[PDB]
Design an enzyme around this catalytic site. Sequence first.
Site, PDB file in Angstrom:
ATOM      1  CB  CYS A 105      -0.868   0.048   1.259  1.00 10.70           C
ATOM      2  SG  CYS A 105      -2.009  -1.303   1.612  1.00 10.70           S
ATOM      3  CD  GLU A 233      -5.676   0.022  -0.867  1.00  8.81           C
ATOM      4  OE1 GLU A 233      -5.898   0.355   0.314  1.00  8.81           O
ATOM      5  OE2 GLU A 233      -4.629   0.310  -1.474  1.00  8.81           O
ATOM      6  CG  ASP A 264      -1.263  -5.354   4.499  1.00  9.32           C
ATOM      7  OD1 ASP A 264      -0.758  -4.620   5.375  1.00  9.32           O
ATOM      8  OD2 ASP A 264      -2.119  -4.916   3.699  1.00  9.32           O
TER       9      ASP A 264
HETATM   10  C1  LIG Z   1      -2.805  -0.757   3.159  1.00  9.17           C
HETATM   11  N1  LIG Z   1      -2.220   0.228   3.912  1.00  9.17           N
HETATM   12  C2  LIG Z   1      -2.803   0.642   5.067  1.00  9.17           C
HETATM   13  C3  LIG Z   1      -2.099   1.676   5.824  1.00  9.17           C
HETATM   14  N2  LIG Z   1      -3.946   0.148   5.502  1.00  9.17           N
HETATM   15  C4  LIG Z   1      -4.556  -0.841   4.755  1.00  9.17           C
HETATM   16  N3  LIG Z   1      -5.680  -1.310   5.217  1.00  9.17           N
HETATM   17  C5  LIG Z   1      -3.974  -1.332   3.534  1.00  9.17           C
HETATM   18  C6  LIG Z   1      -4.629  -2.426   2.705  1.00  9.17           C
END
Ligand SMILES: *c1nc(C)nc(N)c1C
EC number: 2.5.1.2
Length: 362
Positions: A105, A233, A264
Amino acid sequence: ITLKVAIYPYVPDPARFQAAVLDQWQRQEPGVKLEFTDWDSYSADPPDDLDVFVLDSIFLSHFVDAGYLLPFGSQDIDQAEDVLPFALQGAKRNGEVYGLPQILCTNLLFYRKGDLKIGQVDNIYELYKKIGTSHSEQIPPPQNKGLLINMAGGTTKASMYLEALIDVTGQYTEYDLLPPLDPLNDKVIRGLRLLINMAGEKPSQYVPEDGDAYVRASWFAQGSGRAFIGYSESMMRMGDYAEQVRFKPISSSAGQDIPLFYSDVVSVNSKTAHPELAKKLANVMASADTVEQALRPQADGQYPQYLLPARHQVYEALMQDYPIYSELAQIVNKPSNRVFRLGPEVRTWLKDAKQVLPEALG
Ligand SMILES: *c1nc(C)nc(N)c1C
């Protein structure tokens, strides 16, 4: 045999992830039952009976040193060569791989097509030069005015502070040793205040009572604001409008940037009674096949989740049908990219930062 598993909870559609994992698991192990549970790394440690789970890497160092995880030897990782190098490296500690990268992300600068002036913006100061300071506290901002950005919540602001510091110093660090909260870095604080000034105080700190994490994306598609900084997203929520927006990476200063990414990863409990079976499931949840299935629309009226995969094969398979993934693949393949990691003392440091950051930010 039943394995207790937890998928990453914060995505546009977790039901799509849960169904993809189940479908793919059953193809290799139809007899081993999966019991999906709710678990969040931001507010809890791994339960002793939770076999496989997905966590945000800022908490990886803490979990490793506390003896919670089971390392992945080279022969326990499937198709390592397809996984983005920087992502694979960010999953190591004490010389071992402690997690399998599933989702990445990063905030991006969203602007509307035809607005060529914002298309040239590369950092927040240049953005300020174009949109200026907000002149309204209403929620949402007026039509085509100001900046939309989520800066609500302590850990978000603490995270933003630490990512910016690496850009300010120009040297990457996993923060094994977290920085002092007393002599606070001025350059970093001035940058965070600039973002608030451009978005408005109340609008930037707003939390919807239903907990909709993608509400700012819906406001933008409806006409609110001139610019929007949010995760990739955010586009699933834009739906039909996703094709009409433009986006690009944006730095918090003029310099070396060092693109940082939240990662993640899928890990295994050191206490699991089924080590090899658990490792097999961890590989399935992170395989190119299940991630592609989870991101693709699975019913009428549905749109892609627009989450960033960590394997090359997923970007390749989504490209033809969804051309947006071609620009996202380019952003993700930059040589200088890095995973955002935090030291073993994260939790305490986060508590401490909460008593000093809001005051400093006005
Ligand atoms: C990616 N980055 C953050 C900070 N939070 C989420 N939920 C995701 C998928």
